[PDB]
């Protein structure tokens, strides 16, 4: 039975969520409905779910979302990663900060200070996503191309996020 | 099938128990009834159950409650925790004591004497709550269970150490979808 | 050769340090001098040495002390303690916070400002009971890791050390022990 | 026999190097001379040595330095660090970026580059931090550093430490 | 399926056996009947069963009892307990005897030699419970507090009938 | 080099201490002096040393004693004993209580046993320490050394302790 | 399913075999009959079966008995017993002979005393065989001899009252 | 350096002790004297030393003997012997008693026959103790009893001719 | 399900094959027919089957026989036997040679032993195969089954083979 | 230092012992003298030494011999040989006896019962050599060819004196 | 100290042995003399030594040679080689047989009969040489020794499988620098 770990970008990037509906809230609702009738487990890291809720107001959808998408933390005890992964994470932080810095009087340096604090949060989400995907042996669904490139050098299973609805449909119990 | 370890706050904090009914005994009895018809195991550490019985008089409910919610002790023999966990526990005691000390101070010859006994009850309960926290975490770890809490402090420790969690406000909803 | 882990109390409790000299700074300086000519390794946890520097001002003694007493952190990686040590610590915490409350109140057994001064002396008591509990863990873990003899003076810590199988000495005989190991 | 892993700050922060000489190039030279007669091993990560050379021109000292201080890379092959360490590293990056900008903030076109530079050096110094810790862990060595934030981290992880102000002193008490 | 290890106290302390019947022999008889029709294994240490028979005369009930409640010895070969457990046992002996002599008011020499027999029962009970991963059913506060320190599964003995019924 | 774990009865039973001197305090003092020159390690469990101090007032000898005979606790962390040893302990408690009860039979019944428990806890501490250090158990108590024999702990005649100490410089 | 290892005494001591029938060969035949319709495995050591056959003639029953009661040797190849067990066996030899010696006390006196201890060691070798086989198969020892059952208990072998063997077999069909 | 485990028979059988001196207590004293100046460790099981003391009074010599010959118990805690060894011990009991029984054949007849087999099992328990201790220390067994030495050989314990013990000790000073 | 390793003597000793039929070839044929319907695996070592074919001419029965009783070699690669078994083998050779020598004593001395060696090699092949498969050894030879007993291999009375086969559909 | 395991053939076959002396008792005597002054351990299996004493009467040489040549049994507990070795032993027995009867020309029954005694010696020799990691000294072609198949260290027995001398 | 395993070709190929002297027996005896005063162990497989004795009559030299060059058999009991090695051996037999077949052909009613016996001696020696090669490699591996050969074919197999090598022409020089 296929397990998936979802990124923040799955429901915040329009290129991905448009497959459910053009509205954000409507796409999320459609996803939740479909997730009930599909033979799949969905997961999302605690940290990622937190940032998703800061961006999108789910309200009455939250409990249904939390029922179909299990929110687990990847911080297992005694989990060890090889030293190499540590060094690759450093490169991911570089990517994240510099990407945020590109998109940025003194609203250029409280923009800039906000960009790097977001860049750290995005990196701590990336590692949470990968670790959880690794632990569950799950398929990582993510609109962030930079994350997906890293999930490959590390050998995590992937899907084209644009085909998530399609995949889900062809697995209905 | 899903396993849950319940904290004391599941049935003592109104924000959580109101999903079952509006009376404490009503909520407990509604929970027990539903637990019978749900495909799930429930557990509560011995220490947590003890404090729960001091705060609430179950009476005739106790045997039914003890049947649906299994009371186990998490004090395993060959169990080992990393030295990290030990240091994290010290921070939880700090959190517990200082939160309990805030609430003593705020309520605030004769006024000096009610304040000393109010600060002793703040610390002693702060330690009791910290020992319960550990019991809850260890049991959750051992059974690979979903910790149902409500005490934001505990839930955030549970998260640091990778224990499974749920929003306690959605407990009834989850139970209803596992019948 | 013998290895020792030192508590704060070895140089702050007068019943212990008098063996070197009657003054505090004099006792510490005398200890350092003797430690140089003794065939023994001395250690103190980073957390404990920090509290020792907050209570006593070593000044020019610091570098000599830091040479004879090695200041190491016991927070090794993958160190695992059994789960019973977790519960025994919960109990030391209790003993500690309580001993302190005792002195807070018992010291304050003694306008309305009285209430605020009592409020502080209670606050200070728990904050220092948690600092002394963290010290206690640090001391035991360091003693365990090095297989060292714990020199304390604190009854509460030594009782715990004994429960967990850590080697102990009478702190009052430290100078004597050191003298019978000269190189 | 004692082993030490040196940080850049040992020879770039004056508060540390003054124990050898007031002069930077003289402190380094004095250190090198003493290291020859000291019963100790010295090490410095490859990345750390690279940054040290970009700040200080050693010239004819380089070969003597490279003989007394062995320049090794900690990027071993089967090394596994706990997942926790990974999260600790993220916090170290936060500390170093935020320390860099606090410096930057104080001194429009010059500001955008003073802020790029703040965080590119912030990442480089975080990579140096990891290199230093991993090498210290691998060799079971005593980490000598002037940076507070690195020395604070070397404690959470249990790496052996020294007051850098006492380095000369320690070296002298080992022949 | 839930396994259980029974103490002597289950059928000798009236507070516990009254749930089956007011009569002692009738409670045992009722328990055995119910045990047949419940999806649960029952066990009792050799040493505990011996003392139970010295106190209660079962007569024709014995073979039915021995069929529903399996009598095993916990003395498996190569079983190792942590040194800590050994020290905790010493404390249990202290508890057992001190209680016993309170009760003295030749009756000192019986309060000792019974206090140790009760201690040997306690160990046999805990070890068997540990080995089978069973739920310890016991009236005795002291045994149940020790069982808890060592992480053995417990039940309120007063709800034994109720639990059996719901299986 | 030879390691020894000492019981309480080494310095509290006259049959054993007479080899050092006729006086108790003098035998202890003679032992301490001889221990300093001897090529052997001496040890005594914490619990055993405590009871020894309650019986004998060492005074100024305590620091010299605590230098020659090292007072360790045998309650090591990951230590496991076979379940059989646990059952052997129960028999030792019976031996100790019944011996203490015979002598009582002339509050002296209540403390005939409370001492019997303390003596049994000491016995365990002595055996475990002996096991851990792979040491020779020196004890005058018959019952303890007969147990020590069942569990394969090395033994000596306590009456020959001085002689053995002398044959090791 | 339950497994049992049988002693000689289960069919030679009258106090146990009377549960099947009053006559010895009749009891054996009833047992065999019942064992066929029982949901249980029966075993007896080779050495024990040999002495059983030297005491009872059996004849016609032998092939039926050998079908229901499997005769195995417990001398497994890599079996290790604790040194302790070795000492315990010396005590069992003592018990076995000194018993034998009580009967004898009731030339021929020598010829009775020699015969007493030679049968004593044969019975000791039976005891070992029985315990080892019970251990190997994790079987319930059905004996009748108190001394063997006391030993079996110290060693933690599963036991039953031999007087209830028929009853147990009946409740497993 | 060479290690030896001694039997009772090394100082109770005259055929062996005569190499030291004709008198028993004189031989023991010479052995003790020589053992002091020998580069070799000597050992004897607790059970063996006990029976040795019940046969020879010794007295004055005891502390010197206990210094040169270390009296250890071989009942080590985690010792495992193969099941095979257990069977071999049953044969040793047989040998030991049937021998004992030959002497007896030469009331009192009973009191001689009881005494014969009680000493036989005591000697069997000695044999085990000796072999186990020899095994544990990797020591050379010095016996005098042929039956024990035959066993020691089947088990692969190191052996010496007891008649050459003095000679061996002399060539190690 | 039950597995059996068969010796040569199962079909070459009349005391054993008479249960199937009075004729040799008829007993073998009856056995093969019964084996097909029985819920049991049969095996015979390669070496044993070779000698069986030299003694009895199976003709058209061979393919049916080789279908019901599987002919395997027990010379597995990483197989190790304890050194004791090696010494036990030496005693088996002595038994086999001396038995063959008694019967010889009436080139019949030279081949009294050469057969004794072949029979000893067969014995080893039989035991090793039985050990490997955890099979029940069926053999009429007294000496072999008494060895099989010493080494803990499962056994049956060969006289009851038909009866056992019948009680397994 | 080089350890050696000696066969009977070392002191019973004249081709080998002639290097010490022409006389048999003198060769043994000479060997023992040299053995004392050479930096090498010597060993011989129990079974081999027994047969050696049945053939040669040593008398007063025995204790000196037993001091220089340690007589151990190879029957260590738990030693395992590969199944292959077992089959190779069968072949050795075949070799030993077949040789033996050639020689027959009651003398058939002795050529067998000696052929097996020689086989049991062969195993004892190889196992001891294996256990000690020793050099096997043997006159017998057949034993030395087997020793070679199993990877045991060998020497030419004719050069034994020479090797001892250079140590 | 350095250990060496010698091939048959060390003393039979002149290009190698000429470093010691110009006569075969001269070279062997010079080698033996030097081997006595060098801090090095020498070994040769039993099979290799056998073939060496067939080709050269050592006589009185044999005991001295056997003392300096230890003749061991590499047929270890628990020794395992990777299945690669097995396939590589087949290629070595191909090399050996085809090299030996070339030399038979080249030398080349009566001519047919000397050619059949010349092709049988080419194969049978080709197998003998292949078994020697394996013995040499296995012994070298077991002792972690330096293979001294000269047979270019063997040296190139030895290299594929990571055995230590030396130029055989420098053997004397190496021995001289280890005195």
Numbering used by the authors:
A (entry chain B): 1 to 104, 123 to 191
B (entry chain D), K (entry chain D): 1 to 108, 120 to 190
C (entry chain C): 1 to 110, 119 to 191
D (entry chain A): 1 to 107, 123 to 190
E (entry chain F), J (entry chain F): 1 to 105, 128 to 189
F (entry chain E), I (entry chain E): 1 to 106, 128 to 190
G (entry chain G), H (entry chain G): 1 to 106, 124 to 190
Paper excerpt:
One of the first steps of tRNA processing in nearly every organism is the removal of the 5′ leader sequence by ribonuclease P (RNase P). In contrast to other RNase Ps, HARPs consist only of a metallonuclease domain and lack the canonical substrate recognition domain essential in other classes of proteinaceous RNase P. We determined the cryo-EM structure of Aquifex aeolicus HARP (Aq880) and two crystal structures of Hydrogenobacter thermophilus HARP (Hth1307) to reveal that both enzymes form large ring-like assemblies: a dodecamer in Aq880 and a tetradecamer in Hth1307. HARP structures in additional oligomeric states have also been published, including HARP dimers from Planctomyces bacterium and Thermococcus celer and a HARP tetramer from P. bacterium complexed with Escherichia coli pre-tRNAHis. These data all show that a monomer of HARP is a VapC-like endonuclease that consists of a PIN domain-like metallonuclease domain and two protruding α helices, which are thought to be responsible for substrate recognition.
The angles between dimers in the 14-mer structure range from 48° to 54°, and the distances between the proposed tRNA elbow binding region and the active site ranges from 39.4 to 42.1 Å. The tetradecamer presented here is the largest oligomeric HARP assembly to be described so far. Strikingly, unlike all of the dodecameric structures, our tetradecameric structure has no helical features and is instead a flat ring with nearly identical tetramer interfaces throughout.
